[PDB]
Amino acid sequence: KKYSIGLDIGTNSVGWAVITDEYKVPSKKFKVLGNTDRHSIKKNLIGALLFDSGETAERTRLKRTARRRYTRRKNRICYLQEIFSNEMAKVDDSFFHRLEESFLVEEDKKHERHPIFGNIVDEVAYHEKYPTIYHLRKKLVDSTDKADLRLIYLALAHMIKFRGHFLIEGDLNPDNSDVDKLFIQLVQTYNQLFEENPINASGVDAKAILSARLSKSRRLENLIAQLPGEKKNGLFGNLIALSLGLTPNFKSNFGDQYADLFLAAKNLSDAILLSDILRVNTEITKAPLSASMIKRYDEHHQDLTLLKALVRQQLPEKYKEIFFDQSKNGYAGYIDGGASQEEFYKFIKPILEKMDGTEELLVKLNREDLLRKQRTFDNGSIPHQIHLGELHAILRRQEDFYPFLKDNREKIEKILTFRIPYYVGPLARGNSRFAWMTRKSEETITPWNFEEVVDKGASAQSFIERMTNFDKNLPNEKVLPKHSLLYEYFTVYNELTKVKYVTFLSGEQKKAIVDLLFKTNRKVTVKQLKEDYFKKIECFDSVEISGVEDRFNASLGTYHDLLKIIKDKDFLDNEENEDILEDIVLTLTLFEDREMIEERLKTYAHLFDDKVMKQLKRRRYTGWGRLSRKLINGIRDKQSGKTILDFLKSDGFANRNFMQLIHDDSLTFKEDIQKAQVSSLHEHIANLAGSPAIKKGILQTVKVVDELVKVMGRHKPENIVIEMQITKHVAQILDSRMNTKYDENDKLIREVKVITLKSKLVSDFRKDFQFYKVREINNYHHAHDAYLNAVVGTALIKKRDFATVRKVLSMPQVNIVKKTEVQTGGFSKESIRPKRNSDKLIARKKDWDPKKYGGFLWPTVAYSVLVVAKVEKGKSKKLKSVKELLGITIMERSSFEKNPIDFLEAKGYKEVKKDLIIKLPKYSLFELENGRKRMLASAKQLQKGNELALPSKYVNFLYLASHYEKLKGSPEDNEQKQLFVEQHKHYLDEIIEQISEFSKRVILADANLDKVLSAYNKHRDKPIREQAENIIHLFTLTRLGAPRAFKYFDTTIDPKQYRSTKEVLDATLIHQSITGLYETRIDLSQLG
């Protein structure tokens, strides 16, 4: 009557099995629908579900974010066009239209082919006068005469579109960029640090002595040569090296006294970077980025003509290969091909080594300066303030000439400078799953009127309530920051409570250790404890400490940070100010923009003010903690009256750890956790947590349990065995769904007992008693693993059977089911291919013909559709009937599901029989002659779908033949396995014949069969190890799935691809259930 179900859940597989109380898997005659002759097939209640891995939403999030960025960039361009329209439309009637249709071929182009002027003479004059955009930018900055309005528009449109980063706040100044002033500040703070023997010095000429011309290690002698009173190994060399990112010997040169020197060295380093990002830097006043790129263009031109002359005169061989070929990573490949800067350097670098006199040019490669482009991967560090200043200079230079620039200077500057804040989110109207913003009005949001439309308080508060995460130990409670005061003091006390001294720590000792050392220094080591506390206070000469090895991993960074921003130390040591300080760290963790942070902290202005506020406004914290206030110093024990944290302060002689406070059942804390932890099936799965790779596994195993209950007359099991983010989720749902009855005195009736097991027990059961398994032979190991889970679980709850378990491990019929997916994702591969005459190119837009504009390729098929119809064939037309599959792609999926009939007559199929349209997803199973099974991978690709059910004794033979000397058991057992597997060595020559029969029956890969037979015969004499590993990889030939290229000793066998789905037109399609015990067999040969 009663039965048990065993499960084994993985990321790609869910194994399931039914056992009785006699450890036997039942077999039942299952009814089969469809038009086939078969009405009932005998099936066993053991099998496994195979499925695709569940993906995280990350890639979707990146594509979403990028798509928003492109939309907003186009919107900025549209805003600038709207500003220009009223005047420039009088200047040039069709300028924006030409810039819009610049992409089109001339025959699609309604207006003239030249985008800017529309006349060839003025376009050539523009390109001669301004070969790059930077020349036009620099002229518009540096010219006082009346300029043409369209060129002004290209300048600001280039500047607004490609606007640079916002990693630096506020405005730029030479006080941060010019290295000399921060060097003066750094030497000033060093001198006030010691004042005995200072190196007093003026500013430094960093343009040679610290930037790329003598950067990194070279500055440690170049700058030292101007100040020989200090040295490269000295502390001045130390600060310069720290200003160059090196690791100097701080311990040899020498407390938070030196932290000022460290931070000033870091800001000096920042000054060198903002100097070196621009070539000209301080060498000229006008248009610094435009000037830098014009200089780069001039240097590129002269070095290019030098390089061409030198190649043409001294080594004319491969002159065409460099400058004409455009395929072998030459200069023509650098410009007209897809060769990077470093690839072009790497191509000509052995060349330049071979040629003579290249030294003056090769250093430009060694400095990465040679023939650089103006649009490069290195432009990512360009701040937006440079473009802002350039745009401001252009509008101030043309303010009086064009009045609408004077009326809209702040408008254009706001278009460039506006950033949607971290906390506002998307500017939706409720039609977004992600948006949380609250409007204070119902109108269009522009950057000019952003500050009077969004309710920043309500949007901010919603942002707090969404972004806050919730505690793993109690999911209803808000987490603290990882940089919270109580979080750091929690982990400091939790690390300190496991320290034992020999001459455990008591409460007063721990409190004094924290008050004299942890609340004084960032890093505390064992030597500091035994020297500054035990000898100083406890008067202990010799102390041995075993709790901590070298130093404490936890530290009070946040405490000393607050002690830095305000020096009112007793205020930090006051328990009344704890919640206020928690609110500040909650403020800086959540927000990154200065405005709303300023609004939140301004409430506390009546406690402290001025310099402390202006200082603390620059601090920011990142990350979030794993614990809540309501657990650390929250719930209280009934008998002791102490929390987690109160127990951490004092626990008598034996000190108890947070995990062991949870683990101990003698307190009410476990009860307090479990009574508060608890918080349609689709509605029930819609809220659960965990990684996507395992959530799929849980949902599919509960569905498998649903189908299994449906099979067995709705009778419940006696117990269900479950394998071990998911640590209670493994049981949670199935306890809730099986156990649905309760009484007034019994809180829950245990009709089904959910038994939890670890993989160590089942693996040890397998390793001890010769019931071995491998992954390469077949996917029967999942079902065998689950059935073994059921066996051991029932045996342990209860506590010829060995013959039964060996027979079940050697039963051939196991219901392997590959779950059938409609494919979802991007409908094509992302590389845009160039123009071609092929019709296979996918159009990138509705009006862009891919024969002229290129397009995408490799489309993805969501599912295939079997159609029977008449197709127009032949010059002398007649209507021939045909049955064939057609692959529906992801882009055509919706258009197919709106009206399948019209979509099929769009493709050439007429007189389509509508009722015989069958939907075939990926991994649709077809059966053919001699039991050959083929799996539909696409409309024009099949896959292997048959299992080689090799008897268990030979699988034992293969496992023992491998791992020949790495058992790590006992010598008697190891030598017994070796001699016992040597006594069966003829199993090798029988298993190769097993492979031959099964592959000749259902794989049909005869050339590959002869290849592996010849390679086996000519490698017969090699020993057990490497032979026994190569037969393991030959099961790739017989394994279900796509045909992969496996490899023998030396030869590599290419896969045999089944690129023909014509044979499944007459096969028997199997509609297999999630457990596969119910099937619907349709004989497609009777259709059409």
Next chain:
RNA sequence: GAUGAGACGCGUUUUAGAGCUAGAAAUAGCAAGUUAAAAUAAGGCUAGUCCGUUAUCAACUUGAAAAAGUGGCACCGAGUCGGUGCUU
């Protein structure tokens, strides 16, 4: 560790940046090249500076959909399950 927000720089694609000479030419020699526009999932309607690659999905009967319903047992054996016997 799941999950979200805001940004930047590249890349790709088509076009614009007049190629010259010898040429019946299939072409040969030379010059030139660094930049810009437009798009970056086709598109969708509640038209938002929003959404569109995450999750979900055997077949049949009801139901717009949600969702519900849809398939006997015992024994002997085992090449992807077969056979024997009761039952409506």
Next chain:
DNA sequence: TTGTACTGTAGCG
């Protein structure tokens, strides 16, 4: 003009 075989295709920090 239609099927097969072999090799190459794939946008990130």
Next chain:
DNA sequence: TACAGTACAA
């Protein structure tokens, strides 16, 4: 690893 591009059998 599904699909593309080129190269042959009829």
